[PDB]
Structure 1
Amino acid sequence: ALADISGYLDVLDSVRGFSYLENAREVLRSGEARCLGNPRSEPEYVKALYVIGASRIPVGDGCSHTLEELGVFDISVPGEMVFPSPLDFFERGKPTPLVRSRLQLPNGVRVWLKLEWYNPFSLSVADRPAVEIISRLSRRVEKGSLVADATSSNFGVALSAVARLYGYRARVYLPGAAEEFGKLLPRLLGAQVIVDPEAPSTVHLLPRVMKDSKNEGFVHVNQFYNDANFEAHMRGTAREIFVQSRRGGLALRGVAGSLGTSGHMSAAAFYLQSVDPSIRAVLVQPAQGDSIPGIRRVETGMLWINMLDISYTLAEVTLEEAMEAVVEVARSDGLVIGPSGGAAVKALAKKAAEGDLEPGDYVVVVPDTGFKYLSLVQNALE
């Protein structure tokens, strides 16, 4: 029998650790889930169903239910794109678009771009962990409280918009090299902004954010370490790639993407590899010395990509190459993607050129829109 999962969402605040992900993997592998006689007594199984995108739980004795029955494949978007409020727009206005590029890659690699700027608050993939993180906290943190984090730009914008929509104040910390939209748009959205010209990277800033958190008592939502980030992408980004691949008729052979906190690409690789373990994940390594906004090198400390049972391949990409790929996609598709999106197209093209990849459909997650990076666009034009 089926029950509405929204009833059982306290397992989100009681289950800890990654061991529940075994259940998520097996349900996705087998395409079905066993009924729970006492759902309240299996909180790991319930969390696993939420995390893969079920809206209903299987309840009863000996029965089982398919992904489709559990609502993994439910259509959420009203055909007419009308929404009673901004958060309902964020929630129901999904999947984000998956668009075949006209770009031709060597060796039968067909390229599809998943456009994460179609998120309403930061015009970036960072809306999704902001919403899930503030939502989970809205259960236990009193309204009016301050929330804060370190960001490269995007997550701090999404944080400021989302915290305000739920009744919280926000503070964002940024390094001096961050884009101007990152330092300015949070103030527009009513958040306090702290810029460190000394900080060379966003993780550099984490000790200061932690220290100020002890002194002032604000909630440090810590997108680097908060599992709600990874879980937002499992039930959003990754489940969409799966559902979009199936209903789209793609022969999905891999996904490509870039790593900041590593939340969205871990989710993508973990989720799809549960369904089919030969699916590649090609991941961008910014070249040592180079700064590509929003992203960073693996060895510098990433939670999910490291701890989860995920296969991936790295590719080194310089900022110059990322920008040449922004240029090619624009001229080829008329879409203007951000530097980290060009970096992932470039990483996929490298692997294609080397003969490493099966022919088929590859999805590239494009984190944001190039319109936000005019100085780098001007440099690339040269």
Structure 2
Amino acid sequence: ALADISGYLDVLDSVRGFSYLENAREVLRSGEARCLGNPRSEPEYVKALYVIGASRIPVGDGCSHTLEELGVFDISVPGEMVFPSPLDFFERGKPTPLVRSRLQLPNGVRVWLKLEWYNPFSLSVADRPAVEIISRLSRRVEKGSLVADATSSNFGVALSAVARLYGYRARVYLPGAAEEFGKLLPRLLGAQVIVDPEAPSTVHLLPRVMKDSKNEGFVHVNQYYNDANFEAHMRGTAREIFVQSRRGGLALRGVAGSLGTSGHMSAAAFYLQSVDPSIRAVLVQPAQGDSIPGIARVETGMLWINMLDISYTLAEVTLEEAMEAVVEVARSDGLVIGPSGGAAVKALAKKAAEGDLEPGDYVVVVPDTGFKYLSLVQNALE
């Protein structure tokens, strides 16, 4: 028997740890889940179902239900694209577009582009964690409270708009080297913004955000460590690759992406590698010395990409190389990607060139629009 999962979403404020993901992998790999006699005695199982994108849960004595019965494959989007509110537009206007690129890579590596700038608040992937984190937060923390974090740019914009749609106040902390949209947009959206000229990278701002949180009593929502960030991308960004691949007819053989906190490619890789362990996750290591806005090297510290059981390859990519790839996707497809998207296109194009990749369809996850990166556009043309 099928019942609604919304009612049983207190498991989000009770299950801790990652042991529950063992349930996810088996349900996904099998393509079904066992009926629960007592839904409340199985917090791990219920959470796993929500995390893979179920809308319903299987209840009763001995039965099972398929992923489609559970609602992993439910179409959310109104054909007409009419939404009664922006927050509902983020929620139901999904998947973000998967576009097959005219870009040709060697060895029959076919490039598809998942365009995460089709998010309403930050025109970047960072929307998805920001709605998930703040949505759970609405359960516990009183309205009018200040919520805050460090950001390269995208999450601080996403946090600011979503915080304010949920009644909460927003503070974002940025390194001096971040883009102007990050420093400016939150203020347009009613947040306070603090910029540390000396902080060379976003992770380096963390101690400052923790100290001030201890002094001031604001809630530091902490995207690096906050498990909602990984869970958003499990039921959203990852799940969508799963569903679109099947419905699109794709011979999916891999994903390509970039790493900041590691939330989205950790979720894509894990979800996809549950369904089929061969699927590669080609990830980008920004080259040493260089700065690619939004992303970083793994060994500067990432939660999920380390601790979860994920097969992944790295490819080194310089900024100049990421910008070359912006330019060529823009000439091939006329779509203008952000620096971090070009870093993942490039990194896939290398493994493809190397001969390390099987023939078939790869989905690259493009985190934002190049329209927010005029300086790095200008510099890459000259």
For residues 315 and 289 of structure 2, the distance between their equivalents in structure 1, rounded to whole angstroms, comes to: 15
For residues 87 and 332 of structure 1, the distance between their equivalents in structure 2, rounded to whole angstroms, comes to: 33
For residues 285 and 306 of structure 1, the distance between their equivalents in structure 2, rounded to whole angstroms, comes to: 14
Offset at residue 155 of structure 1 (A): 0.2
Unaligned runs of 5+ in 1: none
Offset at residue 55 of structure 1 (A): 0.2
For residues 203 and 112 of structure 1, the distance between their equivalents in structure 2, rounded to whole angstroms, comes to: 31
Deviations 1:35-70 (A, max 9, x none): 000001100000000000000000001100000000
Deviations 1:119-175 (A, max 9, x none): 000000000000000001100000000000000000000000000000000000000
Deviations 1:196-223 (A, max 9, x none): 0000000000000000000000000000
For residues 203 and 74 of structure 2, the distance between their equivalents in structure 1, rounded to whole angstroms, comes to: 38
Offset at residue 98 of structure 1 (A): 0.1
For residues 158 and 202 of structure 2, the distance between their equivalents in structure 1, rounded to whole angstroms, comes to: 16
Task: Name the SS for the 2:368 alignment partner.
Answer: coil
Offset at residue 352 of structure 1 (A): 0.0
Deviations 1:318-365 (A, max 9, x none): 000000000000000000000000000000000000000000000000
For residues 277 and 12 of structure 1, the distance between their equivalents in structure 2, rounded to whole angstroms, comes to: 27
Offset at residue 248 of structure 1 (A): 0.3
Offset at residue 176 of structure 1 (A): 0.2
Task: Name the SS for the 2:167 alignment partner.
Answer: coil
For residues 251 and 116 of structure 1, the distance between their equivalents in structure 2, rounded to whole angstroms, comes to: 22
1:96-107 matches, within 5 Å, as: 96-107=96-107
Equivalent residue, structure 2, for 1:266: 266
For residues 362 and 183 of structure 1, the distance between their equivalents in structure 2, rounded to whole angstroms, comes to: 34
Q: Are 2:61 and 1:61 equivalent residues in the alignment? A: yes
For residues 31 and 25 of structure 2, the distance between their equivalents in structure 1, rounded to whole angstroms, comes to: 10
What is the alpha-carbon root mean square deviation over aligned residues? 0.2
Task: Name the SS for the 1:18 alignment partner.
Answer: coil
For residues 122 and 317 of structure 1, the distance between their equivalents in structure 2, rounded to whole angstroms, comes to: 25
Offset at residue 236 of structure 1 (A): 0.2
For residues 186 and 363 of structure 2, the distance between their equivalents in structure 1, rounded to whole angstroms, comes to: 31
For residues 97 and 219 of structure 2, the distance between their equivalents in structure 1, rounded to whole angstroms, comes to: 33
Equivalent residue, structure 2, for 1:22: 22
Equivalent residue, structure 2, for 1:209: 209
For residues 13 and 38 of structure 1, the distance between their equivalents in structure 2, rounded to whole angstroms, comes to: 19
For residues 77 and 118 of structure 1, the distance between their equivalents in structure 2, rounded to whole angstroms, comes to: 14
Deviations 1:55-100 (A, max 9, x none): 0000001100000000000000000000000000000000000000
For residues 115 and 18 of structure 1, the distance between their equivalents in structure 2, rounded to whole angstroms, comes to: 29
Equivalent residue, structure 1, for 2:298: 298
For residues 172 and 354 of structure 1, the distance between their equivalents in structure 2, rounded to whole angstroms, comes to: 41
Identity of aligned residues (%): 99
Task: Name the SS for the 1:9 alignment partner.
Answer: helix
For residues 54 and 143 of structure 1, the distance between their equivalents in structure 2, rounded to whole angstroms, comes to: 29
Deviations 1:252-290 (A, max 9, x none): 000000000000000000000000000000000000000
For residues 203 and 309 of structure 2, the distance between their equivalents in structure 1, rounded to whole angstroms, comes to: 24
For residues 179 and 304 of structure 1, the distance between their equivalents in structure 2, rounded to whole angstroms, comes to: 26
Deviations 1:287-312 (A, max 9, x none): 00000000000000000000000000
> TM-score when scaled to structure 1?
1.00
For residues 105 and 86 of structure 1, the distance between their equivalents in structure 2, rounded to whole angstroms, comes to: 38
Q: Are 2:98 and 1:86 equivalent residues in the alignment? A: no
Offset at residue 241 of structure 1 (A): 0.1
For residues 335 and 274 of structure 2, the distance between their equivalents in structure 1, rounded to whole angstroms, comes to: 31
Equivalent residue, structure 2, for 1:152: 152
For residues 219 and 41 of structure 1, the distance between their equivalents in structure 2, rounded to whole angstroms, comes to: 31
For residues 288 and 5 of structure 2, the distance between their equivalents in structure 1, rounded to whole angstroms, comes to: 45
Unaligned runs of 5+ in 2: none
Task: Name the SS for the 1:322 alignment partner.
Answer: helix
> TM-score when scaled to structure 2?
1.00
Q: Could you list the structure 1 runs, at least 4 aligned residues long, displaced by more than 2 angstroms after superposition.
A: none
The count of aligned residue pairs is: 382
For residues 220 and 143 of structure 2, the distance between their equivalents in structure 1, rounded to whole angstroms, comes to: 15
